């Protein structure tokens, strides 16, 4: 009888909610009440990267904080030199419906995928000098929404088939499958040590995964609608999510619950992308209303705006040295802010 | 000698921007269409030297609210219609009223003309039981029926067309248009509607519409 099972899970949900309630002795807004505000954050567009034909869904910075790959639904991966605005590579894709792209930490590979249900690895350092497909990782039964390299040989992907997968790139095989989401998994974020990662899905839920074990450590709720974006805090103990309910939220791994909500009455559009600054004091979020809002992550006060884009802000990333922010958009331009 | 390598980077950049100009010509000359009825199937067809790329989604789950945003900038969505009829009306309603598909035109193909022609002979359930307001519906006077068919197939055809035009005329605002078909060549009908879509897009930039 599933009804008896369905009511045991009701009791466990109340037990978890009571354990979380016991730990909520104070709020992060009370702990940070006496600290100074960050003031007004006024970033300016320093670069505008032009050359994509269609809308951009994904960008990813290189670990050298100079090169970055962007993915456009015209069917191109472009690696840019952000210092000089020069294009380094332009990779034509077999399928033009790309929704995610990743830059390997070594700089030797890029990955992309989308509605073809395939993650494609591209070798950037081929002996001849051209850029060719290294592997095509097949096995997902829904579109790829995010992918992130662990190293040159491991990449973790999230999919519209409600799962996440860990791949061995050389063998092309799916090492681990991460099941438990009931909606499309839309975003994933690797922990700083790459032992864990978080994934947000279209069930208004975020989950924390053990990469080695293949099992879900914690589930985080509190959002009202689909989670579009997720990003770890710099020290790996917290993460922020952006949802279609027009709010950002901050969850903590060790307290196992929400700490802040970053919302305003004037904001009624969904968040498409989130990212933290180098110290984690600023939470940057891209929105459907064509803007990016800078949030004081400790006080939940809007500290600034990035207002340069004419269409939907689809993606957003901060350099590993904290030096610059890049935003892609459905108007087919990337902007570097600083 | 950083200027020696900055010259090399500027050389490789102009080579890329040269290819991107050839790619721009191909991209702007092709009309891409979404067909709604491994991860996605691509069909290339050509009508009067115009290139059409039709994309049919396969191996995607029945939840569409995320991956359907990828097609906000197709020339048109081709909506093929097979209570399966009310479900198609609800799907068309949410496409028509989605904030990202609000400038995308829809070409309706009310499929199964022969099936609707044969089902209506004392076996008609999909329009009479599910739509009781059809029993008091009359074929419009400006109807153009096919020469030779039941007078009750043309009534069911125009009722279904008016069910869809009721959704599309509510909040159309002259940004996207609905082209209903099969109530009266399918590639030609797509080509003609795409030409009308492109013309209306240009006449809006010149403020002539």
């Amino acid at each position, epitope marked *: 009888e599933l009804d008896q099972l369905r009511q045991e899970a009701e009791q466990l949900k109340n037990q978890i909610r009571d354990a979380r309630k016991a730990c909520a002795d104070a709020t992060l807004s009370q702990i940070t009440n006496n600290i100074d505000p960050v003031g007004r954050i006024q970033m300016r567009t320093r670069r505008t990267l032009r050359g994509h034909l269609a809308k951009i869904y994904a960008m990813h910075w290189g670990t050298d904080s100079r090169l970055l790959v962007s993915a456009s639904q015209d069917g191109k991966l472009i690696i840019w030199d952000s210092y000089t605005t020069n294009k380094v590579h332009a990779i034509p894709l077999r399928s033009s419906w790309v929704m995610t792209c990743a830059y390997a930490p070594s700089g030797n590979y890029v990955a992309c995928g989308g509605l073809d249900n395939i993650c494609s690895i591209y070798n950037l350092k081929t002996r001849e000098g051209n850029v060719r497909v290294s592997r095509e990782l097949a096995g997902h039964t829904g579109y790829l929404s995010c992918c992130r390299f662990l190293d040159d040989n491991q990449i973790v992907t999230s999919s519209g088939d409600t799962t996440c997968a860990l791949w061995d790139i050389e063998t092309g095989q799916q090492t681990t499958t991460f099941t438990g989401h009931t909606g499309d998994v839309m975003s994933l974020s690797l922990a700083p040590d790459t032992r864990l990662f978080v994934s947000g899905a279209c069930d208004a839920s975020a989950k924390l995964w053990d990469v080695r074990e293949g099992m879900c450590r914690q589930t985080f*709720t509190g959002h009202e609608s689909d989670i579009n974006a997720i990003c770890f805090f710099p020290n790996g103990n917290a993460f922020a999510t952006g949802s279609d309910d027009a709010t950002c939220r901050l969850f903590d791994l060790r307290a196992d619950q929400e700490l802040m909500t970053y919302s305003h009455d004037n904001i009624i559009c969904g968040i498409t992308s989130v990212s933290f600054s180098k110290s984690g004091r600023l939470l940057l979020a891209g929105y459907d209303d064509f803007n990016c809002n800078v949030w004081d992550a400790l006080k939940a006060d809007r500290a600034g705006v990035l207002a340069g884009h004419d269409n939907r802000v689809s993606c957003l990333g901060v350099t590993d040295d904290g030096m610059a922010v890049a935003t892609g958009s459905w108007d087919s331009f990337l902007k570097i802010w600083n | 000698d950083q200027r020696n390598e900055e010259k090399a980077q500027r050389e490789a950049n102009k080579k890329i921007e040269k290819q991107l100009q050839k790619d721009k010509q191909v991209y702007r000359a092709t009309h891409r269409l979404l067909l709604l009825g491994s991860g996605i199937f691509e069909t290339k067809f050509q009508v009067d030297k115009v290139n059409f790329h039709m994309f049919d989604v396969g191996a995607q789950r029945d939840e569409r609210r995320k991956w359907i945003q990828c097609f906000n900038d197709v020339t048109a969505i081709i909506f093929v219609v097979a209570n399966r009829l009310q479900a198609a009306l609800k799907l068309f309603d949410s496409i028509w009223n*989605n904030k990202w598909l609000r400038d995308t035109s829809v070409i309706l193909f009310l499929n199964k003309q022969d099936l609707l022609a044969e089902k209506v002979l004392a076996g008609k359930s999909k329009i009479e039981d599910y739509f009781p*307001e059809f029993a008091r519906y009359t074929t419009p006077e400006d109807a153009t029926p096919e020469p030779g068919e039941d007078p009750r197939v043309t009534r069911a055809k125009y009722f279904i067309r008016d069910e869809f035009l009721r959704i599309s005329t509510a909040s159309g605002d002259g940004r996207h248009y609905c082209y209903p078909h099969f109530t009266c060549e399918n590639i030609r009908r797509v080509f003609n509607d795409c030409r009308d879509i492109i013309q209306r897009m240009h006449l809006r930039q010149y403020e002539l519409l």
Partner: nanobody, 126 residues
Framework: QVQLQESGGGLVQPGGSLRLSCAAS????????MNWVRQAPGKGLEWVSD????????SYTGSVKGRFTISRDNAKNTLYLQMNSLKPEDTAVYYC?????????????????????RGQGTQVTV
């Protein structure tokens, strides 16, 4: 956490009446358009009725116009379906389905097999 809990179903004589309630929890109820969806034995999920955020725009599937009436009470976070003149083909599991995103006109995927913002349903037998 988003939670929809249906109640008020049960066995009823043909021609009888029945009132279903949906207790909403975990979201701003008034920001969302709400739907009723049913799954008859052997069939797939089928849309029944919807109501807009305020309660003004109301629609029904054709086979229930005049017999069913939908209402929401935004103060109590409750959605209602009042069913009159019930027919033997109204036997189904009735689900309270929330639209995916707030402040929207479109409502995608509420009749999908694994839609998340849908309750466990309540059985209505005629």
């Amino acid at each position: 956490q988003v939670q929809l809990q249906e109640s008020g179903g049960g066995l009823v004589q043909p021609g009888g009446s029945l009132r279903l309630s949906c207790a909403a929890s975990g979201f701003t109820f008034s920001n969302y358009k709400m739907n009723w969806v049913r799954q008859a034995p052997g069939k797939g999920l089928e849309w029944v009725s919807d109501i807009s955020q305020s309660g003004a725009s109301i629609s029904y599937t054709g086979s229930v116009k005049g017999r069913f009436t939908i209402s929401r009470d935004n103060a109590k976070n409750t959605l209602y379906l009042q069913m009159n003149s019930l027919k033997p083909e109204d036997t189904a599991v009735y689900y309270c389905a929330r639209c995916p995103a707030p402040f929207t006109r479109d409502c995608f995927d509420v009749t999908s097999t694994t839609y998340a913002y849908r309750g466990q349903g309540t059985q209505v037998t005629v």
